[PDB]
Each structure stands twice: as structure tokens, then as C-alpha cells.
Write a protein that binds this ligand. Structure first.
Ligand SMILES: CCCCCCCC(=O)CC(=O)N[C@H]1CCOC1=O
Ligand SMILES: CCCCCCCC(=O)CC(=O)N[C@H]1CCOC1=O
Ligand SMILES: [Co+2]
Ligand SMILES: [Co+2]
Ligand SMILES: [Co+2]
Ligand SMILES: [Co+2]
Lengths: 314, 313
């Protein structure tokens, strides 16, 4: 009975998601740069890179990818439709506003409701003039902390969840404990935390801090496998195995946050700095290592199939 | 000098004629337009832009310099439609409009990547077209000189040094940020005669204004009709006084008019600055200045020769 729009305006139910990567990207670009300086980009090559990435995940049994690209990081339904068509993978899209500091004057001068309404439109009508609806909302906080504008956008994500019941999938930054501001704001807004992911929690191996989040009842995103600059692979794998052994499995989500294009850094820089980052590292290295430490096949399926499904059905 | 105008034709500075040096055709926020097109109507935007430029045209305006750059919604194709419907020359530029931050794309690559982007626009073309940028914009406002704002100002200066296009600025007089533009341009070796210090008309403080003028730059008395920044009568008195005090060759007049501005609902704009248009200088400013002894030829020096000299030096 829950219906999830997917890139192309089809719908699936949560039961047919199957093996899912809950936080990945197809193309991460900056709208104001791309609009004004198209010569710095190449759409054919972006498309090839996203297709190649998704096909690689698909060879390992991925059926569904949740694209966490929203406004501010270059969301494009038409791009995603080409990717979906070429690959046959389900692509789930969302809404929200991605920022660490400021929001546009457009919404600041109109008030929080204007931002909620834009999100609700994407969820109930469709994204960017299409019939693909947003099936989740994103809230973002980072190293600048809880600025007024960031607070507004997090609260607008919350209010949009209260009106539509779509899950809230977040970005946080663990070094300043911003993860906890998400939870506090969500509690104030009456959000059921079981319908939320506190993101980028896998960027720390501090288990007591992770449990402080877990005891509030939310999902956590162990979601940057392959980005050693946030936390090395060995510590991420160790953390995930330990959290399963301690009884936290129903709250764990795994992903790579992989960006087949990311315009924030030259591609040479990304290759030099995180050469292991792909959309398949979980299947190549993480799962084999977890299996060798006693994690079961069914535990892996609970994480990669049942948890993403339950985020969408409750 | 050859000046590209929207459409990729080129004009020489002599053919600019009566020029509005700081206006807009459409001021919108790229990230919002890209993500929520349902909040916009392109036919209506076009119509408002055309109507505004045709009103100006009625008063003899031949050329409008569109100060819309990256950050506030610049679109060559939109402008080409306006140019073609109206017959008015539209001159475009490049730069990055921000009061605080610049994109990660540029911050992680460094200053040269932003310079090169501007230079691309000036020497090859804007947005895949053959309309080249004819000026570069630099911006500072009430947040002051942040690190990113400083970078973008210095990048505009460096692009000016490579290409010799003029620099038309935005500043905020309330914190004296106008003076940071000046200091930075001097450090970069810019001839200030090739620059406009923008939004100076937002104050009637003669001493502050003369501090800028003695540096040799043009000043933008460029928001006629925005009473919320400064009432029309103070703007008019200030312009008359500056002419009388000998500064005519450094004065530029405009309205900063936005036929669309997505920062505010249209009803709030109508309600707050109902006299804001792209023709108020012709309807009210010029008749008041003439009644105070300002001559016809003085008016032409400000509205014809000054914009020309900005492009020729
Ligand atoms: C030198 C920097 C090396 C490149 C590392 C890549 C950094 C990232 O791309 C992290 C990242 O993805 N942050 C953004 C993009 C996905 O959504 C986010 O929150
Ligand atoms: C509260 C309602 C304010 C109504 C008028 C707002 C007018 C402006 O926003 C002036 C303005 O355009 N400033 C921006 C945009 C043109 O270049 C600028 O720097
Ligand atoms: Co993130
Ligand atoms: Co991400
Ligand atoms: Co301005
Ligand atoms: Co302006």
C-alpha cells in the first residue's frame, strides 16, 4: 500500500526495493556554477560515469539506489531517468535543501512555510515539472553547526515529514556533535525518530557517541565506506561488526555516498585522495570481512534489504 | 573597442548612445529556479522585461547594461529574446555575486579557476554562446570583507588586468565596504578610472562620497526609485550638488530596476517601492535637475559620455 515513486514516474512498493544502497549519488554538481559556466562540464561523460557506477553495483545484486542529491548539490530528474533507463536499477529521489550555512533570500524573505511548501510539492505533485515524486526529505548540518538558516531548513524538513509521512534521511558532521541537534529539533517537531536516518555516523569509531544516537531510536548511516579521509576502512568495518554484535542491527544502514561526478574537487584530486571510493566497495571488501568475523548472510540481508524497506514502510 | 551585445552582434562605444549603465532584465536565484520551476513563469518574466525595456526605449534609451551575473540568474538566451523583441542593445558581463561565500568548486581550486572562468566569458563567450562579457562585476555588502568575498573581488580585478574590460561593482555604504573595493583594486594595480564603485547613491553623505571620488573612480548613483535605500529627493539633491562641486565626469545614473526579482514576493515589492521603474530618471530626476540649473549638455555628459568612457577609458 505504500507507493514509492522512482526515477521515471513509475512506482514500486517497499517490498520490491530488494537489495538497496540507501545513500549514493549519480551526479553531484553545483547549480550556480553549471548554470553560468557549462564549459566546465561534460554531460556525456557524467552520464557514462553514473551508468558505469550503477551497472557495477547492479552486478553485485543491487536492485535499488536512493539518490541523496537534492537542491544545492545539483538534483536533476531528467538526468536520473537516463541513468535508470540505461541500467534498469530503481532510482529513488528526494527533496530538501542542502546547505551548511545559508539558505536563499528567496525562502528567508518568505518564511519557513515557503520552504515546507516547496518540499511538499515535490513529495505530492512531482519534482522539476515531472511525475517523479520525492519519496524522502533531506536535512543537513555540518561543521558550521546550527546556524539560523540551517535550523530553518531542518525544521522545514521535519514539518514536511509530519505532513506527508516520507522518511527523513540526513547529513550530519560528527566532529561537533551536530548529529544531536538533528535529534533535538526532530523531537521538538514531533517526529518519530524511527522514521529518520542520522547520517554520516560511520565517520567515527567512537562507539559510546554512536550509542547515544542509537538509544534515541533512529537509524544511523554507516554511509561513507571508501572515504578514508573521514574514517579509514578498517575502523568502519570494525565499527559495523561491533554494533551488530552488540544487538543494534535493526538500526544500521550501509552505503558508500559515492559520487560518479562531484564538482567540488578536480577529479585528479579525488583519485589521489580516496582511490578506493566506488559504488561497490561494500560488496568487494566490507561484506567478506564481516562474514569472516562471524556476521551471517541473514544479518547482511537484514541490513541491506530489510532496514531500507522499513525506513519507507515503518 | 568592440562590445558584444546580447545576440553576439558587436557595437563600438560610440554607438551606445543614451545608456542605462545598471539595470536588470530578470534577477532570479539559480538554485531555486533549477529545483522548483513551479515557482516561476517564464512567459510572464519575459513580458515584464520587454515592457520595462520598451518603456526606457520611449525615452530614448539605446543601450542597457544588464548587471545580472552568476548568483543572480544571468541567462544569455533570455536576454537575446528581450533584445530581439525591443531593438535595445543589451550589454552583459561576468563575475560572481555573493555577499559571503563562494562555491566549493572555486574555493577548492583557488583564485585562478574563478579568474579563468571570467576570462572565458570575456574572451570566448557566455554560456556556450558568442555573446562575450564586456565588463566584470565585483560585490561586497553588509557582511564586509569575508575571505570568499575578498577572493571574488580580487578575481574580478585580475580578470580586468588580463582583458581591460571595465569593473562595475556592488557595494553597501552603511559599513564603508565601498572603500575595501578601492583598497583591493589598488593592491591589484587596477586603474580606478576603469571602475565604478556601486550603490554610492544610497547615501547623501558628501564627505564619504568625496573620499571615493578623489580616488578617481566613477560612482554609481544607481538606485533611483529605491526609497528604502534613500529617498528620491535626497538622491536628486546629492546628484545636483556633486555636479556643482565639479564631479560630473565621475557620475553614473541608473535605477537598478528588476522587472523580476525572486528575492521577494512581487506584491511586497509593489507595496514597498511602488515608484521603482526603469524610467523614473526621465520622468522625475532629469526634470528636477534641469529646474535647478543643470544643463542639457550636462545631462548628456552623464548619460551618454560617461558610460561610453567607461568602455573606452
Ligand atoms: C580532497 C578531497 C577528496 C575528495 C573526497 C570526496 C569528498 C566527498 O565527496 C564527501 C561528500 O560526498 N560530501 C557531500 C557530497 C555527498 O553528499 C555530501 O554530503
Ligand atoms: C522589502 C522589499 C524590498 C523591495 C525592493 C528590493 C529591491 C532590491 O533588491 C534592490 C536590488 O535589486 N538589489 C540587488 C539586486 C539588483 O542588484 C542587487 O544587488
Ligand atoms: Co552528506
Ligand atoms: Co551524500
Ligand atoms: Co547591486
Ligand atoms: Co543591480
Amino acid at each position: 500500500m505504500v507507493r514509492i515513486s522512482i526515477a521515471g514516474g513509475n512506482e514500486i512498493d517497499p517490498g520490491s526495493m530488494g537489495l538497496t544502497l540507501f545513500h549514493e549519488h549519480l551526479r553531484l554538481i553545483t547549480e550556480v556554477v553549471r548554470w553560468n559556466w557549462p564549459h566546465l562540464y561534460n554531460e556525456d561523460e557524467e552520464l557514462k560515469r553514473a551508468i558505469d557506477a550503477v551497472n557495477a553495483a547492479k552486478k553485485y545484486g543491487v536492485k535499488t539506489i536512493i539518490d541523496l542529491t537534492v537542491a544545492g548539490i545539483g538534483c536533476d530528474v531528467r538526468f536520473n531517468e537516463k541513468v535508470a533507463k540505461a541500467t534498469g536499477v530503481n532510482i529513488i529521489m528526494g527533496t530538501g535543501f542542502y546547505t551548511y550555512t545559508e539558505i536563499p533570500f528567496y525562502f528567508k524573505n518568505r518564511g519557513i512555510d515557503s520552504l515546507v511548501d516547496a518540499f511538499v510539492h515535490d513529495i505530492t505533485i512531482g519534482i522539476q515539472g515531472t511525475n517523479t515524486r520525492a519519496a524522502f526529505v533531506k536535512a543537513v548540518i555540518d561543521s558550521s553547526g546550527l546556524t539560523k538558516d540551517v535550523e530553518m531548513a531542518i525544521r522545514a524538513a521535519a514539518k514536511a515529514h509530519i505532513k506527508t509521512d516520507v522518511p527523513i534521511i540526513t547529513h550530519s558532521f560528527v566532529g561537533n556533535k551536530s548529529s544531536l541537534d538533528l535529534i533535538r529539533i526532530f523531537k521538538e517537531e514531533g517526529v518519530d525518530l524511527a522514521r529518520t536516518v542520522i547520517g554520516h555516523v560511520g565517520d567515527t569509531d567512537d562507539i559510546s557517541f554512536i550509542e547515544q544516537i542509537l538509544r534515541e531510536g533512529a537509524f544511523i548511516g554507516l554511509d561513507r565506506f571508501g572515504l578514508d579521509i573521514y574514517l579509514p576502512l578498517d575502523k568502519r568495518v570494525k565499527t559495523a561488526i561491533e554494533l551488530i554484535k552488540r544487538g543494534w542491527i535493526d538500526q544500521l544502514l550501509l552505503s558508500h555516498d559515492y559520487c560518479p561526478t562531484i564538482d567540488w574537487y578536480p577529479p585528479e584530486v579525488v583519485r589521489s585522495t580516496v582511490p578506493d571510493w566506488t559504488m561497490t566497495l561494500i560488496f568487494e571488501k566490507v561484506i567478506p570481512r564481516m562474514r569472516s568475523e562471524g556476521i551471517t548472510e541473514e544479518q547482511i540481508n537484514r541490513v541491506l534489504i530489510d532496514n531500507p524497506r522499513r525506513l519507507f514502510t515503518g
